[PDB]
Amino acid sequence: PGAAEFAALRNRWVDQITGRNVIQAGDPDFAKAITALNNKAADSLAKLDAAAGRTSVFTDLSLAKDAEMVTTYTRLSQLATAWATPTAAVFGDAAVLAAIKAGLADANTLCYNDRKEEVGNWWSWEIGVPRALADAMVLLHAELSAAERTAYCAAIDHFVPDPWLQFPPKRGKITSVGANRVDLCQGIIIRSLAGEDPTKLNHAVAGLSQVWQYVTSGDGIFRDGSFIQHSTTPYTGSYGVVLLTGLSKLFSLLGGTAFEVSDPTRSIFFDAVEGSFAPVMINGAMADAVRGRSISREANTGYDLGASAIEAILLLARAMDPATAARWRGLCAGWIARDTYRPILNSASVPRTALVKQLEATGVAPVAEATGHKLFPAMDRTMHRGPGWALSLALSSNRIAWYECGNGENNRGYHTGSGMTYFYTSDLGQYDDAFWATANYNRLPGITVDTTPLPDKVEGQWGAAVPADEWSGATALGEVAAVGQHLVGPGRTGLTARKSWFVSGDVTVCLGADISTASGAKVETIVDHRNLHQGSNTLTTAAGTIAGTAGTVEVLGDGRWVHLEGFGGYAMLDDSPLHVLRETRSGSWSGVNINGSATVQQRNFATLYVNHGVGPVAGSYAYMVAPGASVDLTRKLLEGNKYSVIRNDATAQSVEFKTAKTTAATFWKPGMAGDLGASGPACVVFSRHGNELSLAVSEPTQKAAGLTLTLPEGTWSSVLEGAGTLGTDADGRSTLTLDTTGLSGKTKLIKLKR
């Protein structure tokens, strides 16, 4: 392959990034996209430093700050994009071209060149600048000199000699993985188009393959669909999206060329659309639980990330077999149609607009989010759905960090892994409308929490980023899931708690046991901490209303239920007092992210909690949540033994669902919970149907070779489905022995016959 093939690829890349081939005359969304492009370009031009011997390119960006050096280069690539977009205000404009070139020249001379060693964040030098600079080089190819292209390739090759690796030489270089691998490879692939380097191009394409190879520990994609980055953080929703975006663009660019991605194992990446990404998409937003430090970003939200995922999936759909293309497009049409809160076309690029219009033209119907349970044991995350709600649980364990912070971002997120219960609903903005600027980071929904204040950036014993806990894990059978977390508190307080969740098609039962701490501070468990936006949403009880006065906490009656207007119901399953607080909270994004704006956001919250007191001894809680329940349905929750607490202690926690005819349990120690027993740590859900017993079981430590259940519901003679060995115990009970070697927390489904 030669000059003609490289010119075609540069032109394909310019087509992709401008949409110049696909702009529709008179389409109002394309018109708004051209406006947004024009407004940004004009903002950047007006901010140009026009001075002789200027030491910056823009008056508001310092080249000595590595982040602002990146922004200097993305502004320049944006300007070059606009300059190349038909109908844009600066399209083909000579003065604008001159300004872009002078900007690239001066940034190189002053800062970003092959004689400069990196200072500050490696990512700026190796990913931020090279992707932008390379785009600019490709957009401006006809206008840039041989000398300019040489200098700019020399700079990129100096900082990124091999995109399979990262870090400046001073540091020891390590293998780049996941999102970083994709981004490094992208920068080199586009630079290789500008410099017509097939050797570098081919190496960089080959580098992509590692990112979709299954792993069994640490960074990457797991067979259960989990995606981990930063070694110990669930990351499908942010880094996973970066990966997804870059691959979509690169696969599209190279397709049907001499450089096309032909690694047949890329099917693993395609399988991740449904296996990894779709289950953590919620009405257009990536779940906060799988987006790590990005929750602290005012302008990199769950909806921003979901919209990026949708763009990518639509782009990838073009190359798939008909059935898969249609399935992906139907998933996307649903994520778009249900999202009336941040509609995808508002502020969309020209390329994104084109893909969303293309989707609308297929006539593919929106696909609903399926009810039920999607478990991700490798990353300590579960998803659960019913009509009108999605529950996302955020756990932590000896595999999964309490939280991830860095670069000034998410330093306060230390409780976000302490058993959070995110209930996503038709309140589409619940977690987006300045939630992370205003929420009480010590009273996040669902958590158990030692009230000891923790410093920003706190770590555990000996600098540990992961709790040395017993296990976190889950299983599910049909409509019911069992999830457990042995919580070890962050910040060396000595908090311990056994938290479990039993989730049906409608209601979530939350049990807690064995709670104590070493700090001397009171411990709380948070039934909810719920954004009311600017509302005065009523809290209704058997006795009338509660918490009518902001700032004055009240204790619930013996009615034991409370309904929150606009949300649903809560009910207590023990005698713990429930404290109910209506509160107005304020904060700026600058309080949670070094880059956040100073604007103060003020939001109303409803906060419902149990106080375990100071020095609890085997403290406990038991409550349930009924998203979408009316007042009348909430009043009825505790009637007729519908939700039965079978056991709630340091041995086991278990609930029977009457209507579902299903029982769920977590075991901490060998023992019985009602008529089910386990020989060690386990999650179990079981249901009898006539002469058959169905069970789901997991071995949640991920380290035991075997597990034996003592079966409920009498005698069992045969194993119809799944693997396992029946026996009988000393008391005449049937037992089921499982070989759990290497199961990695995955569920075994078993069906037995009488």
Ligand SMILES: [Hg+2]
């Ligand atoms: Hg610099």
Ligand SMILES: [Hg+2]
């Ligand atoms: Hg070059």
Ligand SMILES: [Hg+2]
């Ligand atoms: Hg941290």
